[PDB]
């Protein structure tokens, strides 16, 4: 029952950190238990909330991009190549560990940086030293999407409708709606 719930777990994490809200996606038997690419959920986002980094060839230029980030902000963060396989994860600063964390699922997450803003062994994993970075097809890049209230809601609705219906219906739902789908139960929590 929900093997491929990475999208829900990431979205719940962002909602906890930003909205002070736990989300429960109330599904029935017969859903699409598949990996969900969140990309289309962010098509309506303002341009200032989507940014492409091209710094992952070298440790120091990535550390620098990371050190620019505001430590109270949360991002949906896509790694991979422009034409190809992309992976979404949540990027947040966990004050308890004093570093940026990448959270893809309950079973796949790592600390990106140490207390002094330098990459950990796992953070060095993000680097792709022997291929080119940029905006052209086949280049490596990072895409940062602000996990604003609006982007969290779009991601939540997109996943919910994708799983219960299909991708086309989810795109159309996200175009018409800006509030959490009624079947996504929220419960307030402290932040």
- 190 lines the binding site for another protein (CB under 8 A): no
Residue 82 engages another protein in binding (rule: CB under 8 A): yes
Helix %, strand %, coil % of the chain (to 5): 30, 25, 40
Q: Are 164 and 31 in contact (CB under 8 A)?
A: yes
Q: Does 1 bind another protein (CB under 8 A)?
A: no
Query: What track of x and - describes contact with another protein for positions 92 through 121 (by CB under 8 A)?
Result: ------------xx-xx------------x
Which two tokens mark 187?
């419960």
115's tokens: 């207390």
Alpha-helix runs per DSSP H in 145-184: 149-164, 167-176
Q: Is residue 127 at the binding interface for another protein, with CB under 8 A as the rule?
A: yes
Q: Please report, to the nearest 10 degrees, the dihedral formed by the alpha carbons of residues 59, 46, 11, 190 taken in order.
A: 100
CB of 54 to another protein, least distance (A): 11
- Please, which of residues 12-41 interact with another protein by CB under 8 A? 34-37, 39-40
Contact flag: residue 9 with another protein (CB under 8 A): no
Nearest distance in Å: CB 22, another protein: 24
Q: Using only C-alpha atoms, what is the Rg of the chain?
A: 17
User: Of 158, 156, 161, 154, which is closest to residue 24 (Cα–Cα)?
Assistant: 156
E-assigned strand segments in the chain: 21-25, 50-53, 75-80, 86-94, 99-105, 108-111, 142-146, 184-188
Residue 179 C-beta: closest distance to Mg ion, Å: 6
CA distance 155 to 76: 10
Is residue 2 at the binding interface for another protein, with CB under 8 A as the rule?
no
CB of 65 to another protein, least distance (A): 16
User: Is 43 a residue that touches another protein (CB under 8 A)?
Assistant: yes
> How many residues contact Mg ion, by CB under 5 A?
1
Q: Summarize as ranges the residues that interact with Mg ion (CB under 5 A).
A: 131
Q: Summarize as ranges the residues that interact with another protein (CB under 8 A).
A: 4, 6, 34-37, 39-40, 42-43, 47, 50-52, 79-82, 84-87, 104-105, 107-108, 121-122, 125-131, 135, 137, 140, 143, 167-168, 171-172, 175-176
């Amino acid at each position: 029952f929900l093997n491929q719930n990475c999208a829900e777990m990431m979205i719940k994490k962002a909602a906890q950190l930003i909205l002070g809200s736990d989300l429960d996606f109330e599904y029935t038997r017969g859903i699409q238990d598949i990996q969900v690419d969140l990309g289309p959920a962010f098509m309506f986002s303002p341009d200032e909330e989507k940014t492409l980094w091209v710094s992952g060839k070298n440790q120091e230029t990535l550390e620098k991009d990371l050190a620019t980030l505001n430590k109270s902000s949360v991002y949906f963060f896509r790694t991979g190549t422009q034409g190809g396989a992309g992976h979404w994860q949540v990027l947040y600063y966990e004050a308890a560990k004093s570093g940026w964390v990448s959270y893809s699922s309950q079973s796949n997450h790592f600390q990106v940086t140490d207390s002094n803003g330098k990459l950990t062994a796992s953070g060095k994993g993000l680097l792709v030293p022997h291929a080119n970075w940029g905006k052209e097809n086949g280049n490596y890049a990072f895409l940062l999407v602000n996990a604003s209230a609006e982007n969290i809601i779009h991601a939540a609705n997109f996943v919910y409708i994708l799983r219960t219906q299909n991708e086309v219906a989810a795109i159309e739902y996200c175009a018409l709606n800006h509030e959490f789908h009624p079947e996504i139960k929220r419960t307030a929590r402290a932040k």
